[PDB]
Amino acid sequence: PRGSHRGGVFPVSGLTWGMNRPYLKRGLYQHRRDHIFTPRWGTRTANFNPSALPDGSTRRWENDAFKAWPLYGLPHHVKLYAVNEARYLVPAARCTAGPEITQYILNQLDPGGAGRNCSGIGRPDVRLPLAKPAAPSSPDVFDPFGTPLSERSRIKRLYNLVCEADSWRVKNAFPFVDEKAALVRDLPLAEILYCRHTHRLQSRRHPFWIDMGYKKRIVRIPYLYRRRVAKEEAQEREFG
Amino acid sequence: VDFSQNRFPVLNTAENFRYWKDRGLDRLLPRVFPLKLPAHRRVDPLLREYIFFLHSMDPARFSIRKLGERYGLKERTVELICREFSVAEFLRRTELATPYTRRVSREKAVLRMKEALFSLKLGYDQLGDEDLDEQEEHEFRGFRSTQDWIQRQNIEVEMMSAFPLPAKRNPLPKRVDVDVTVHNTSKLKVMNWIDPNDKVVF
Amino acid sequence: STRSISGRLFYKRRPLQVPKLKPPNIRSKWLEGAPQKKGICVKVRVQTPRKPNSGLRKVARVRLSTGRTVLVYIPGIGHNLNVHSVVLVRGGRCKDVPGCNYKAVRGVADLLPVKNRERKRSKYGVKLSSEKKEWRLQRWNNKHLTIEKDRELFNQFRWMTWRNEEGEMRTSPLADDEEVPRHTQLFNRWYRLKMQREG
Amino acid sequence: AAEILVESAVEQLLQVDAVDPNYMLRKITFVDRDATNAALLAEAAQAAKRAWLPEHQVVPAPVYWSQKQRRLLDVTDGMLMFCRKHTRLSFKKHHGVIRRQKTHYFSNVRPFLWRSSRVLEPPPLLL
């Protein structure tokens, strides 16, 4: 495409335009990133440091940083994995058809075999947390040497699910009744376009001119701020 | 706990396919997900220097494969680590540029910021956590992974029988042209244009 | 829906049975598939628009180079066209005037461009005046404005180590009759750069 | 497994670790009954030859010729004046959106297509 957009120009954020709306006129407003979801995965500082020594005391982690840079292997992860492993092995544990079907169910639950890395749960030479202890695997055949059973490694799929559940974890009265209220709320376009990025418009503008617009803003916004503030201060001085 | 008409408690179900993925009005919640970082930028810089020393000293005994095997990394990751460290050391020792004056792209500057905050939060890894030879694991890896492109179908409709069915017609590998260099010197590069369909080869 | 291709002669019958609406741009058929044509004004007058609109529309009957005579609207305010005047004519429909389907290109031939025009200049053939060009450069001579927050911050942080344009240092905070000084390396940077590049 | 086996055999025969070598094992024979496994072991041994033996070491031809003509240069401070720029970062200043698709194809793509098959850059030649 080329030239200016001919037709209806809507904000890419999905917010309406009007006299008392976030936007005064029609436009794309792709530079206005405050109207889209940008997680804060870094730190934040303050304008002033009251302390007499520059210790970096104002610097602090952002709330979204704890979800941006997670840590896996925590004790609650371990506990959740243990409970879920018990529940997930319930089927093979309570199967009473035969060794063939038991192995089939075990392979379905945790694929493994030659050339594969499994948990070794069903292997005869691996220790399991049974409720009723029994022979590891009558008296005639056994292991005359010590040969302790090796430990069982985790189920990678289930452990990954448990670890990733954190990203999906979500954190009388003045009796005044609302009559101008909505029964079923409302679902505008902005609620979607704020966070679902793939629905928004891809710009045809040159990155050179995008950068130029940023540079112009960095120099012109303070002047407009001071223009309106000076209007207000002059009016107050005149009133005084 | 909902109802199922058949017994198949596994992770390979349409319900569990993309587990934890929103399937209702919660799709519009602005969730924050963990940021992805390269392994060659996650491992500790001292480990990078050690790997670079071993490789630049004895690339035979300390092969890329062996270094990755010992330090839990991939061959590509080891290669990237060595390249980056060699570039940085060349620049530093020749006094061409400091680590904060090499002109880079915006994407690489953002990557540097990402790793800086990752180290400040969790700290650099002291050992690699990758796998040498990735495994055949059923995972969602984009929309391209959810269909049989050759068959052009997402669903395999089939009949119920207790006896063998006719086999499916297998695809035949595409026979595409390739260029294979045969003679390269400081002045001329000669490569053979190969057409795999030509029957008379001589 | 395939009842229209019945029989053996479908390939000749059905292609005849199709929509027969007018061409999209038949309103300008007398340009003969050309972007624009020159013509001679045979008549120049003012016509009354169809109701409810009222007023007078400036129109001319013009004999194109093709020999056809057509009605042409004169867009803009004021014109000098008379009889025997040559005008370039383009496709444009004036809905008010009955039967008017062509307009005259301003600034071409004997049709002078609209006077006292500063917007939509390219649609009336008006050049960018020298005064406008000079103002489009002198306009961005940035103005210095303060809100007393600059004064507070200057007296709290900046006055301690500050340098005048000549390099002189400050020895006291800002008085009540002194404006906040400009930043010697940041204020009016673009305009100053352009002026210095020019000379 | 073949790479590990062959490399371990080579390292032990070379006594890389020992500070006081004990040269006793001198013949190591990997015997296999499967043609595929024997061929894989042979491939591993070939890679080991490439890595260890200077005769069998290989190098891309561009690198080979560049290092053969290798030269030592003397760079002064005044020779890097224009190797450095004013901007800290680099980014693409123009989008890649084509204004006229058919015109672009006719003017800048089609004239250079001397064959309709899609072929990649060849792998480098090993010398």
Partner: peptide, 25 residues
């Protein structure tokens, strides 16, 4: 409706060019 002064353009003071400090491989 004060907007500023504009009396001192500050054009006589030259704008120092940015240095070429960033290396390009």
């Amino acid at each position: 409706l004060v907007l500023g002064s504009n009396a001192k353009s500050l054009v006589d003071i030259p704008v120092r060019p940015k240095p070429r400090r960033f290396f390009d491989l």
